[PDB]
């Protein structure tokens, strides 16, 4: 008799990816710096989210790369904002009876969905597609989250008369006072 | 009849790279193909031949429709699959990733005995912990009962409660409460109240200060 | 086969592991050919002596200033040339025979008996010393009789004239010479000789002529090679090749198009001649396609005539082609690099693993350079190292190395404006004696040691650091946030204990705030948790002057900020991690001062030193109960601060030390001193006296400026005063007797911060990168490891600067207050940091044990990647701290307390009395 | 060209009159009553109009055999399923029943800490407790470890069967002394999976 015992309930603040399906294709909720929200086909460092609950049932989704907060507007489309508000940038999480998580703004009555069908939420009716989310633990190594952007390209002093190509001479930035 | 290479019959229904369903659902692994003529499809799991011998509970046989049905998917079913059907002139295959997840539509269950009936000497460092378990995001709050006016009960039989530690955006270690140099007033019933979208559950413990030992 | 070497960039795309490539220190294989090069126009001189003919160079320089009539006077000086070879330790002498000298009047004429007499005397001298010769038949000096009559190499009738001249060379100088080079640098002879006009024949005809001439060079070389093979090789057993110069090129954006474009450039400059000689006999397909018409075609008989006409691969990788004479169009819009290890691998893969003989290498220095050429020595050192890496790590079959230009001489089109010689020649002098340079002494020792043998000064030392050693980490900018996360809610709520488990706030009754302890700060505990995992004994952090006192004066104080610092210091002591606190830190937008104080001069006004004394007094009163190690200045910028600023900074430190010594040390048994950035300064040439003097002078301006008043004589360093006084720069303030006594002994320990070492050269190679203030030419040893920020990994510098501080300032307790390196990438460079940490700590261990240095602390630089980016031992990604590989290895050093051997253990030390810590007073 | 009074396609293959599908198990109901010309087919439940918007998950109406599918069936779908197909003249009515049994989307979890540490002697016997949260009564076992080579933390499987009762549940370790030690478990399991919990259970 093999023993595994995988503990249930470890997602109390860890990195999660929101997964939704529609019988056509899968998509992971993703937040970009420019506020664009779309669906990543696989797990991306951009799609890594950290849901945090403030009240007994209300959660806020941030994302650790864009440094933004998943907010919402009157039409029902979602976006990311660098500033937090408790009015519309906060959604009441609700686990459906089939095991799927749906997020909707408490005062906007519109479910958070990866599609463009922003419909109202009622207890027990066919929700819009791309809305039945499913939290997935982040299996992406966190080494990739570091920004590799410090890339340098040298154009000055690049000609056909270079005298020190291997850069033996490296002067140091020293100030010289002058009376 | 030309001997054309096998190809996907319906490429527009193959974009679901990853399958994720709650434990207990049935996944659909469908991949119509072609050939000279259409050959048999033998699914194999991560290399090992996958059929109805390694998992009892129902595996529907659909070969004329070229699909695989996985009824009552259980935690022990994660792993990329393959639509490996071999033709004489062509060899096509598309991976079908499945990641079943285990849900918990329940109120946050706290570890029994945490916090415990721990007593500390006056001037010592006591620490109260409440291990909470809930897949949905819980809100952890630490409460202390007060005797503000008369007894500890309020207007309509509600015990007075003052919040010590909360779970905000930038507040971690919420499930641990630190009480160093406990005075006489640092004694009473500490309840760790945890709740999520399903419900709220609290675990209460009593801390008593001993002036002598 | 062509195209095999296109994978070269793939192998070298991944950075090598900085463990085997770090302390590489290999030894060249036995039988290696250590050679030194020379020419017949660069050095020989005597352009009309003893009936000598007229080269195309003798007419190019005169063009009927900067001519090679008598360049090095080597024609008349045979004894001084071979004496240099004897004292150089070299085993091969690569020189060339002047075509117009041996055969002035005509190839089918009377050989010049005196011209032949010079070369037989030279070879007789080479035989006596044991130096084997490597004769180059043609080194760009074609007779003028063959340029104005047959038109030069553009004619195919010069193959017979070259063959008749080669037979004269083979017949005469055949019993002693076993290595022949037919034509040296056929690319420069062809492309710049006829297609550009920048070289000996002034033509500038067209690229058609350059490809026609190079067509004749291969035919002329193959005509000579088959002359040796069928007539002289059976009775002589020598070897013949062609010196194929090349460059190295790098992709622009690292794409498959760029890699093919890079291989297209190499085939255009190197496969142009190597493939017709080494592979099949025809040009590469890359250059046969685009310029199919302007490039001449090869007959089938000719193609098999040139196949295999080279007994070894002769490579000329120096300043001739690299960056100077390479056609820009031949680069195909790519990046040119002077990489020799990658080029040697490219030759090995592409040309079926040939026996490579590097017949010309090295770099050049400016023309106004005497026996001190430190830039050229380190280029030679890197280039020699690159072949050793190619031999050992790449499997390349390199059989010899030739350091070019045994002596200074006429450097072709550049004239005398550059010098490539290992031996200095005074061109203006009438004697022209060979004076060994810095590279001559370096090359001689490398040949004697046969490469880079391991040194005892770099062998790791197995030993244990003393007890109560200060194994610590630093965090200059701790993250401060007075966020009260515990007991911060004061209201009284109701509780639906049975109904709904919700809170109903009662309006009207609230409680009073509990005593705020140190667990109410949400960020202090996570930081201590990481430090507990590192097993560090000490933690070093600096206070923010602009935060404790925002307006500078003591009228207003930020008590909440002080409470965070006091709580951070109190929690660290609770977990047995001694805090080390720095009062002031220069790294800030306002020089670490409050905005009000930073407006006037920010260090110029003496009131700043006074205002720091009161600020230091406030810090000792609040934080001092828990902090027992104080740092007054935290590595001040000795290179970026003015003399007046450094004058008040010394006074400010003295006031803070005299505040602590008189008022607080009795109540709180702590210590206080100054932290100085002690980066080692090493002379570029190890045997140059003027470089040692320059190294000491720079050290005075860097370390001794702010250490001599405190740790030494109480006044500014003598060398610093001499340098400024003789410069008529009297900007260094003088120390009065009251000030001198004030700062004379304001130290409890020597806290130094070491990061890297810098090579200093007295001579100025170029004035642009020359520090005219200090008359120093800062350089670096390119063979050293480098961080992505170009910081040299020099472990032995820490041991050297520790001994210098002990020698200059006595036997003081020395703290390594900060010593770490950065990693630009995520995990590809952290294996460097563990190498950096392991060796630097080991060299600090060497200084402690071998030199008896009173070292009582090592502080790894940076606590995490968030506070100090790129330097931390903890990776900060997605608002999460993850330990790096350097952290785990650092913890193993801390737990073992140094580097214990296989079987050795020190017992527990209770109340050990090394004089660096707080005893019973 | 006669009138339209047709039958279905497969008589025995269509009607089953009973479907005890577990929760989350996909099932579909078919009413292929063909004919000429093709009639219209309407599906309704509990005497009310049935669409694809009033049910969770979602249903799909096929036209190859004129059937609706139910991916991820739910307990809320209980009731009656009447399909009504009417031709130009006349009508055909069929009935279907559905009682989906409850199947939780998780293996039966239990409150942590339990079972508590066993530390008692004769006179006050150990009362080991383990409460499991589930809809129905799950499978709960204890699985006392057989003491061979200190088998408490190893590999290659440790099958040590020990059955007292399966069905909040409590156990009465009568006459607790220094003869039964080791680590104890609460093997709570169901169809989805099996779970157990343990702590620093050390007894004299
Ligand atoms: O408006 C709005 O709102 C909005 O607006 C705005 O906002 C927007 O805009 S924007 O721009 O902004 O964007 C818009 O957009 C919108 O919108 C939104 O929202 C929406 C919604 O709305 S709401 O309302 O909802 O809210 C959404 O939307 C969605 O989507 C859309 C889209 O998509 O577009 C839509 O839709 C529509 O359209 C579409 C289209 O698409 S596209 O692409 O085009 O575009 C679609 O479609 C169409 O149509 C259809 C129809 O028909 O209808 C089609 O299709 C579909 O379906 C189909 C079916 O077919 S049929 O024929 O039927 O029809 C599919 O399929 C296929 O096929 C099939 C068959 O074959 O049949 C298969 O099959 C399966 O199943 C069957 C049956 O079963 S049962 O049960 O029934 O019977 C089967 O079978 C089985 O098996 C067998 C065998 O085995 O053989 C059997 O058995 C037998 O035998 C046995 C033996 O024994 S043993 O032993 O062997 O076993 C015996 O026993 C027995 O008894 C016997 N039986 S019998 O029967 O025979 O008697 C058995 O039994 C059986 O059974 S079972 O159970 O088992 O099963 C088979 O097998 C199966 N399979 S498996 O394997 O899996 O199972 C399948 O299905 C398939 O296959 S294949 O291969 O082919 O593939 C298809 O697929 C579908 N589609 S897909 O897509 O998917 O493709 C057609 O086709 C189409 O067309 S096309 O062109 O495309 O092609 C859809 O559908 C429509 N709809 S409907 O209603 O109509 O449906 C819409 O809208 C929606 O959707 S829905 O659906 O929901 O509706 C959107 O998205 C939104 N947007 S956002 O933006 O927001 O995002
Ligand atoms: Cu459940
Ligand atoms: Zn030098």
Author numbering:
A (entry chain B): 25 to 203
B (entry chain C): 142 to 354
C (entry chain A): 34 to 97, 119 to 975
D (entry chain E): 142 to 308, 315 to 351
The authors write:
The direct FGFRP–FGFRS contacts bury a modest solvent-exposed surface area (1542.6 Å2) and are preserved among the three cryo-EM structures. Akin to the FGFRP–FGFRS interface, the FGF23–FGFRS interface is also conserved among the three quaternary complexes and masks a rather modest surface exposed area (1668.6 Å2). We targeted site 2 of the FGFRP–FGFRS interface in each of the three quaternary complexes by introducing four different point mutations individually into full-length FGFR1c (E249A, R254A, I256A, Y280A), FGFR3c (E247A, R252A, I254A, Y278A) or FGFR4 (E243A, R248A, I250A, Y274A). As in the case of the L6-FGFR1cWT cell line, cotreatment with FGF23 and soluble αKlotho of L6-FGFR3cWT and L6-FGFR4WT cell lines robustly stimulated FGFR signalling as detected by phosphorylation/activation of FGFRs and downstream PLCγ1/FRS2α/ERK signal transducers. In contrast, cells expressing mutated FGFR1c, FGFR3c and FGFR4 had diminished FGFR A-loop tyrosine phosphorylation and reduced PLCγ1, FRS2α and MAPK activation. Specifically, we reasoned that a primary FGFR1cP should be able to pair with FGFR3c or FGFR4 as the secondary receptor to yield functional 1:2:1:1 FGF23–FGFR1c–FGFR3c–αKlotho–HS or FGF23–FGFR1c–FGFR4–αKloth–HS heterodimeric quaternary complexes. To test this possibility, we carried out a receptor complementation assay using an FGFR4 variant harbouring a double I197E/S217E mutation (termed FGFR4ΔSLBS)—corresponding to FGFR1cΔSLBS—as the primary receptor and FGFR1cΔPLBS as the secondary receptor. However, robust activation of an FGFR signalling pathway took place in the L6-FGFR1cΔPLBS + FGFR4ΔSLBS co-expressing cell line.
To reveal the molecular mechanism underpinning the coreceptor role of HS, we solved cryo-electron microscopy structures of three distinct 1:2:1:1 FGF23–FGFR–αKlotho–HS quaternary complexes featuring the ‘c’ splice isoforms of FGFR1 (FGFR1c), FGFR3 (FGFR3c) or FGFR4 as the receptor component. Contrary to our prediction, all three cryo-EM structures reveal identical asymmetric 1:2:1:1 FGF23–FGFR–αKlotho–HS quaternary assemblies in which HS enables a 1:1:1 FGF23–FGFR–αKlotho ternary complex to recruit a lone FGFR chain (termed FGFRS to differentiate it from the ‘primary’ receptor FGFRP within the ternary complex). At the membrane distal end of each quaternary complex, HS engages in tripartite interactions with juxtaposed HS binding sites of FGF23, FGFRP and FGFRS.
